[PDB]
Amino acid sequence: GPSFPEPKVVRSQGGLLSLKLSATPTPLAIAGQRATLLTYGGSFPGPTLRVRPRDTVRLTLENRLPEPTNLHWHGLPISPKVDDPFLEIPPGESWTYEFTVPKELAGTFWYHPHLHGRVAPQLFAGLLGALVVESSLDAIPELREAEEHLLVLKDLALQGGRPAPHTPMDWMNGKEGDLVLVNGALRPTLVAQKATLRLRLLNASNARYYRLALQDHPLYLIAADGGFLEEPLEVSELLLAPGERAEVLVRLRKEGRFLLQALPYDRGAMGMMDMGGMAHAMPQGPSRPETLLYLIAPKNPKPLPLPKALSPFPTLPAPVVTRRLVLTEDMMAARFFINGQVFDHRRVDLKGQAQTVEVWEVENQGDMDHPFHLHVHPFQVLSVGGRPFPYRAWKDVVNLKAGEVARLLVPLREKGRTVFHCHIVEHEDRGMMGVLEVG
């Protein structure tokens, strides 16, 4: 097959993507070995859904797992009556998700389970896939002529031919695996045919971070989680926290082989040490560097010029309220809190008004990185750690290192009850989630 593996694409037909997916334990060949994963559509990652604004999506999820599950349409500003974080599909049962793709939308999104208490093992076992919203922007020559690929960054650990079980330490840190895969493949080779690549990036890992760097090359960020930037932004590296997406242009400068690496990064994961007497927690330190893929540049590469502009970011109304959400940890108990509380599905924590804008100040008073995710309502990151953000674009996950405050501009869109949580999904399962009601 193609030297570069990517999930199969399912496209809307005549404005309708009607699809039945089964969540099912599936024997597969993965990274040269045989394993039984939990999959959507029989594959890992699940199929990529490619749609356009105003399309109708009609996705029937059949639960063939031995435990209940559901779907989160991560990043989609749709109704929480569709993207329902409280819905439970019992084993054997089916549920049909139907929504219209919003008109003003573009970028890389994804789907995965969101059943509180069960997310981390289900997501770790392989239940995820991408959703791409095509834009009219894709027809500008600087993007249309680029070579496009999706890179689903997700790691895995196998034990006896199945996903490795969660240990108590995994619930504290978030589980990482030793198999650091792109699109389910171990260090695939990408033999580029064009000098400009358009790479959609998805961190679908439970907890692993990807400090992305391409050897000898900068990256040109053209989209964040939920939409285009206003213009490309040159970066030397790009950190993708769990649940985040990005789109980058790569402008291949010369012939040769270049590594795409996940450079060492310390997210505050903790181990345990006994040095005489007392056993206590100790930092794991930075991750070991990982090669994600081998990128082979074509003959005499002449990259396209960059697009001068992408999408203007909407001017937002002046905000009507400021929130503060403080994140804290009880590491030895693997308990995690927002404003001193753990999630309770019966308890409404924030009440806002649709079509108003709020300022959310999210403060990480823990020692671990926490990537904060809000459903349903994409936000604009104003600043993190007192540093202004270098671009304007829609995001739905913001990473907070220890001590950092993120200031977010949150327009409230669809009415209903939804959630916000850490997207180290172990921490969500362990309480770091709250309930927002929009009326």
Segment lying near Cu ion (by CB under 5 A), choices 138-146, 313-321, 366-374, 386-394 = 366-374
Segment lying near Cu ion (by CB under 5 A), choices 99-107, 157-165, 183-191, 365-373 = 365-373
427 binds Cu ion (CB under 5 A): yes
For Cu ion, give the closer residue by CB, 158 or 374: 374
For Cu ion, give the closer residue by CB, 258 or 337: 337
For Cu ion, give the closer residue by CB, 18 or 79: 79
Residue 373 labelled as part of a binding site: yes
Closest approach, Cβ 162 to Cu ion, in A, equals 23
In the chain, the largest separation of any two C-alpha atoms, in whole Å, equals: 69
Closest approach, Cβ 83 to Cu ion, in A, equals 9
Total residues contacting Cu ion by CB under 5 A comes to 8
Residue 116 labelled as part of a binding site: no
Closest approach, Cβ 329 to Cu ion, in A, equals 8
For Cu ion, give the closer residue by CB, 142 or 414: 414
243 binds Cu ion (CB under 5 A): yes
**Scanning residues 64 to 83, which ones bind Cu ion (CB under 5 A)?**
72, 74
Among 118, 175, 200, 370, binds Cu ion (CB under 5 A): 370
Among 221, 424, 436, 438, binds Cu ion (CB under 5 A): 424
115 binds Cu ion (CB under 5 A): no
199 binds Cu ion (CB under 5 A): no
Residues 176 and 179: their CA atoms lie apart, in Å, by 9
Residue 370 labelled as part of a binding site: yes
395 binds Cu ion (CB under 5 A): no
The binding site for Cu(2+) consists of 72, 74, 112, 114, 280, 370, 373, 375, 421-423, 427
Could you list the residues known to form a binding site, using ranges: 72, 74, 112, 114, 280, 370, 373, 375, 421-423, 427
Residues making contact with Cu ion (CB under 5 A): 72, 74, 114, 243, 370, 422, 424, 427
